[PDB]
Amino acid sequence: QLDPITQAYADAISSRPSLFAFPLPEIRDGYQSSTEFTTKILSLPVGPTGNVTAYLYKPVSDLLPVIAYFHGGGWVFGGPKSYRGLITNLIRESGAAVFFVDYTLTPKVAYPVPNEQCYAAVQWLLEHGEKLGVDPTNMGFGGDSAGGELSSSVSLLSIKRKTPLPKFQVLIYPATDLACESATFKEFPNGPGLTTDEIRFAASLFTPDPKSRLEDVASPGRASDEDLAKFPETLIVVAEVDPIRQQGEDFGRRLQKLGVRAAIIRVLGTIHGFASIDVLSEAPGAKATIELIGYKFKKALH
Amino acid sequence: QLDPITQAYADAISSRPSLFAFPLPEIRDGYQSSTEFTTKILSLPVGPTGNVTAYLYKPVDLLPVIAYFHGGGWVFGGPKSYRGLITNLIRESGAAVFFVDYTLTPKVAYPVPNEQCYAAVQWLLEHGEKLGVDPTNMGFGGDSAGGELSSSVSLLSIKRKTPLPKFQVLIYPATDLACESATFKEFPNGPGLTTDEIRFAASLFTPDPKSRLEDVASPGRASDEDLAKFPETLIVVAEVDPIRQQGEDFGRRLQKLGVRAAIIRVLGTIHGFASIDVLSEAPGAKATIELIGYKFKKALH
Ligand SMILES: COCCOCCOCCOc1ccc(C(C)(C)CC(C)(C)C)cc1
């Protein structure tokens, strides 16, 4: 069922204790190990905590299109280092700038603070982007896993507050419903790459109050028909062997029914994380869909 | 379950009788109704009938070239009905397309279309350079019945030790003409392609069920040793499609045998989405059509 490269990776980490457990490391972001880009480090004096860290990445040589990217890692891990591979791929394929939001990780904060940090950073980009050489009117959203929850959350908050939506949104195996368990939870309870236990752990740090999980801002899969019908055109990519697979597909079908242009693609033989884990990302299906994502940002953002 | 555009297409034709029935339409290929590429009509003195017609399309040193084998149940299709997909492929891939206009059933039957396609490829390999294309940078593409033909030509290349393409794309392919698979039961008349249409096509192409067991007819049933030598392959499949299982199983089989094989399922769409003009503009269809072209572009150099 799994392709050899993905199977080899799964075998190599079956031996590893899960990192989603106490005590948490104090380093939450690190490198996993040809396209060049510039980096501007931004401390934005905005949002619930008074600061949001953002990195603006631009390809080398009028206004560049820009992808606001919200990284995954279960709201506990990740940052510019661990996502360097995906950011590079996005920049190589899309030709766009990447606005990478380095929001505060759990449990230093909890829902809805990372959501509002991401939302506030986007509002800043909208106002000041032109001065950094990007075109805020040509904006994409991207997010993977927990970042997919954040991407769709920020979209929903934009709809609620009547602030600009991106032209195009990509959700990669997104978490869309933190409250309910879906069919694939049962099908792949610890099926490699992501286990039901890791999911519960991440959800307990990000939304310690289970009642929070029912809110549409936490779980955009539970948003109203009226709000979701206003979503930007969206591409959803899911891994086949993945407890969280059902959430993305159901969310996409829901967008389709409501008249949003939404494409949904299932990649066979791969697992959660294939877009950001270097080893997984070189397998045929993963590699193909990663360049599709970048290619589709290139086509949508002009 | 289907996206609005695809659902509307399915509804608009739900009252129409299947075209896979007698009497057959007298036109077997027509426009669904070029300035982006040139067209050269080639009469190749090859194959069991002594002729194979091929169209060489070139976009605006040597061009990469995609040998394309069209679908239509072996009974229908040709350059006219595939004008939209070919146009898309050329735009997105930037490659030339060698479109094999093989003889349709039942004027001929298996294995003549297979052998026509194989022989047209051998001609391209020998003469491509003088046509301004690079035979060492070749792709295979095929949809549905054409996916049977594409994987059949690959299998024949291996058996006969002739050059393989660098990259192969199978779009909702038929890979096994002998067996009914799980999705036959799940979508027996699920729109776009029905189980009756499947058995109808097979009755003209392979009237003798024993032919269907042959690996050349059904590459999904080829030996491990042959399949392990397949070129790098991307398989794209529609979700609501009786034949969905065949493409997915074939890909899993290539993956296990150590061939680099990607398999992608497009949700909310049906058989034929890559060549039917209306279906091809829906989000999922459109994305995967550009994916296909885009990956030919990246693979062919
Ligand atoms: C009159 O002009 C019509 C020609 O265009 C129709 C064909 O193009 C769309 C593809 O439709 C099909 C439908 C069925 C099939 C077959 C029957 C080959 C599927 C199979 C082998 C799984 C039975 C192939 C293509």
Residue numbers in the entry:
A (entry chain A): 34 to 66, 72 to 99, 107 to 347
B (entry chain C): 34 to 66, 72 to 98, 107 to 347
Which text from the study accompanies this structure?
The 3D structure of TmelEST2 shows an α/β-hydrolase-fold with well discernible cap and catalytic domains. The active site of TmelEST2 comprises the Ser190 nucleophile located within the conserved Gly-X-Ser-X-Gly motif, the proton carrier His317 (β7) and the other charge-relay network residue Asp287 (β8).
Because of its superior enzymatic activity and stability, TmelEST2 was selected for crystallization and X-ray diffraction analysis. TmelEST2 crystals (hexagonal space group P6522) contained four protein molecules per asymmetric unit (numbered from A to D), with r.m.s.d. values between Cα atoms of different monomer pairs (referred to monomer A) ranging from 0.18 Å for molecule B to 0.22 Å and 0.29 Å for molecules D and C. The higher r.m.s.d. values for monomers C and D are due to the presence of a Triton-X100 molecule derived from the crystallization medium. The four TmelEST2 monomers in the asymmetric unit are arranged as two dimers (A-C and B-D) related by a two-fold axis, one of which (A-C pair) has been used as reference for dimer organization analysis. The substrate-binding pocket is composed of two differently sized, tunnel-shaped cavities (overall volume ~1930Å3), extending from Ser190 to the outer surface of the protein. The Triton X-100 molecule present in monomers C and D is oriented toward the bottom of the substrate-binding pocket, with its aromatic moiety facing a hydrophobic patch within the major substrate-binding pocket close to Ile244 and Ile289 and to the oxyanion-hole, and the hydrophilic polyethylene oxide chain pointing toward the solvent. The detergent-containing monomer exhibits a closer conformation of the substrate entry site, with the loop regions interposed between residues 48–50 and 56–60 shifted by ~1.7 Å toward the Triton-X100 molecule. Indeed, docking analyses conducted on TmelEST2 confirmed the binding of the short acyl-chains of pNPA and pNPB into the very interior of the acyl-binding pocket, whereas the opposite orientation (i.e., with the pNP group pointing inward) was predicted for pNP-octanoate.
